[PDB]
């Protein structure tokens, strides 16, 4: 209930981050979203990938510059990998996403996996 409030705050930050990461050169690859829905809804479906929501929550919940550490039991999709790389170029935080195979260390617009995962 109050946890729904934490989610709400993450979705709000995500919208903000979405605009800035777009300004930084992120272009959402919506050809991936296999639903008979409009382009805006497809872009929202990608923005709402849970690793983005968890990163947005980490950013509002921690002091500026704090390393963000997110764990996802599933592989990070190509679109999230691009989004988080670009976010790491404009947010002065190390962002670490642990997926099913590795620790993706996003720093300064690069990932430690070299985009091969
Ligand atoms: Zn889907
Ligand atoms: Zn994704
Ligand atoms: Zn990576």
CB of 80 closer than 8 Å to CB of 21: no
SS (H, E, C) the chain: CHHHHHHHHHHHHHHHHHHHHHHCCCCCCHHHCCCCCCHHHHHHHHHCCHHHHHHHHHHHHCCCCCCEEEECCCCCCHHHHHHHHHHHHHCCCCEEEECCCCEEEEECCEECCCCCC
Which residue ranges make up each domain of the chain?
A: 2-111
**Ligand 3 centroid vs 97 CA: distance in angstroms?**
8
State the ligand closest to the CA atom of 33.
Answer: 1
Q: Which token pair is 31?
A: 């050809």
**Ligand 1 centroid vs 36 CA: distance in angstroms?**
10
Method: X-ray
**Ligand 1 centroid vs 40 CA: distance in angstroms?**
14
**Ligand 1 centroid vs 12 CA: distance in angstroms?**
21
**In angstroms, what is the resolution?**
1.8
């Amino acid at each position: 209930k109050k946890a729904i409030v934490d989610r709400s705050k993450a979705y709000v930050k995500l919208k903000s981050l979405g605009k800035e990461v777009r300004d930084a050169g992120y272009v959402p690859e919506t050809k991936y979203v296999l639903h008979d829905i409009d382009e805006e809804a497809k872009e929202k479906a990608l923005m709402h990938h849970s690793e983005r929501l968890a990163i947005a929550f980490g950013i509002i919940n921690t002091p500026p510059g704090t390393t963000i550490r997110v764990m996802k039991n599933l592989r990070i999709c190509g679109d999230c990998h691009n989004f988080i790389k670009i976010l790491s170029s404009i947010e002065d935080r190390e962002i670490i996403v642990r997926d099913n195979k590795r620790f993706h260390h996003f720093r300064d617009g690069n990932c430690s996996c070299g985009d091969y995962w």
